[PDB]
Amino acid sequence: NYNYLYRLFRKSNLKPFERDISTEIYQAGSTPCNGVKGFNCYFPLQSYG
């Protein structure tokens, strides 16, 4: 099933007792994503096998 998704990547840590649901691409390198993965960009949210 793929109903459970979790985040791998974020700019920083998370404060206690709060939630973030920002479904946005992540800049994994110096190359800006500009809304496109391309290279050095991956989606933080992914499912579980």
Added chain:
Amino acid sequence: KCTLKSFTVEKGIYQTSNFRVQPTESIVRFPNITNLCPFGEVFNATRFASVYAWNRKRISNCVADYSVLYNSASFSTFKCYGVSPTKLNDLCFTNVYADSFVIRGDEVRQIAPGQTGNIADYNYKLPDDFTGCVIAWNSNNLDSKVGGNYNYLYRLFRKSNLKPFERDISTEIYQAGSTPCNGVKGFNCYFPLQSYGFQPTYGVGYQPYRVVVLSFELLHAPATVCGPKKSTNLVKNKCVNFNFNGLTGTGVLTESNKKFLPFQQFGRDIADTTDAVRDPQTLEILDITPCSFGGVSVITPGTNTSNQVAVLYQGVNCTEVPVYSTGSNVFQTRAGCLIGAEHVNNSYECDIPIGAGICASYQSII
């Protein structure tokens, strides 16, 4: 009123709080930094050795900036497992080992922990707990030749697999069958090594691909090789926080005439309080004095009579006052800096003792 916890205050002087001149900015000064690790001859050599004879290089006692290496866009595959690349310049181990070879395009993924394959089991084995990075970039324009590059060979046949960080150079004829061979091929004897057939006409995944694997080892010897540590400029006559070559402290820096012997780095006076520091870059002896701090006090003639007060800053020069930045005429005395009371020429009895032989009283406040 807050400090006294009352709604009325009688005549006198009280102490409310303290102040200190806050630092302005941050300055760090570090050695000139040299001895870059020789990765140019590793990642930009004339040629690389075969996969079953992977070239091994030792990196120790130098500085290696991985930021520029990561920023290179010529790498098709850049896989780091032990640590994230952005933290390469932060943490480091005692030495680095580089394993360089050339493999086919589809075999790039085979160089990974817990992976099986011809290269992964007969040419080079990676431990499941491997830490470091793997970099694979195309070398079709360099290694591959139109006539067929047979200079690169790979092992294909062996009874047992390879141990992690193990290299095999044996040319013994593999004996799949039970019939021994006296170093000649036959019914069940074949050469374990096969030559690569890299050609420019070959498609994507068949071109030669140079792979360099960096593994960081942390034996108990002190660490020597990792990313550079940034250095900044210098200011004077403005107390800040400074990080001179790992020595962190806050104060104002001035020119000093004291003499260091050519082997000291930073002096002190007594009670282990730093008093003079020599900069790592220009090698000049300075002097350190923290900016003044003092307890403020309120002189008031009593809530009942009036409601205007005077402020005393204890033991500070009347040069750095900062809402009472201006107020009234400012008086500078031996005890401190007085604001809100005017200075007169007469001399009366003492009412609210201030110090250094002077005191104030209510007429305004004099």
Added chain:
Amino acid sequence: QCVNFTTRTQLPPAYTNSFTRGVYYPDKVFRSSVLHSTQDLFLPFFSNVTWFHANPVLPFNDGVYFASTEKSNIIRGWIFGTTLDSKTQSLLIVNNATNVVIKVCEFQFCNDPFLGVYYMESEFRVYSSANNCTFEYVSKNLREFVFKNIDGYFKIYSKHTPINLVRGLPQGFSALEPLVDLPIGINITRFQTLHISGWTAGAAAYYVGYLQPRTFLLKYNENGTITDAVDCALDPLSET
């Protein structure tokens, strides 16, 4: 490239009064006109120093103080290690016109390791085999050297002083400025002094002493140089 030898230049060791030598700068922090008490490994005052006129194998222990009254830089080399073979790491130190020349690895030393001089000099035969290593470092008179190995750091302090007296150690005081630090740790237990050049050298005298942990009181003048040192665990007067 070395052979055996027949003339066993084995001589009994003499004994000399140590006096007040063997003081180095403990910390690299400048001070002015102060009296600072510090504890460390030192050469105890008014001890006895072993005098040597082939060259035997001597223990290293905590630390070593090596002194030589020489003319025109006689003593050159130093061998450090535990087994002095290819089984355990060994250290080779050579003194030249430069500061020091250091090799850190396993070599093979024979009974008579010496550099050899050709009379323009080109000769090296102290060892025979070189398996592997990484650490190489290059940078009338009395020379004093303190060799220490503390928590993975090898420290060599050196000092030179013009002297005219022949036999005894000078009745003078001079601190030992630090010279070389190596951030490498070895468990050395023995050391040997290299021979010079059949070899012809009989007047090769040196003083050897050992260091122990104890406390000293040091006086820093206004210019940051040590002028007086007072031992603690020596006399009822010194403890006061």
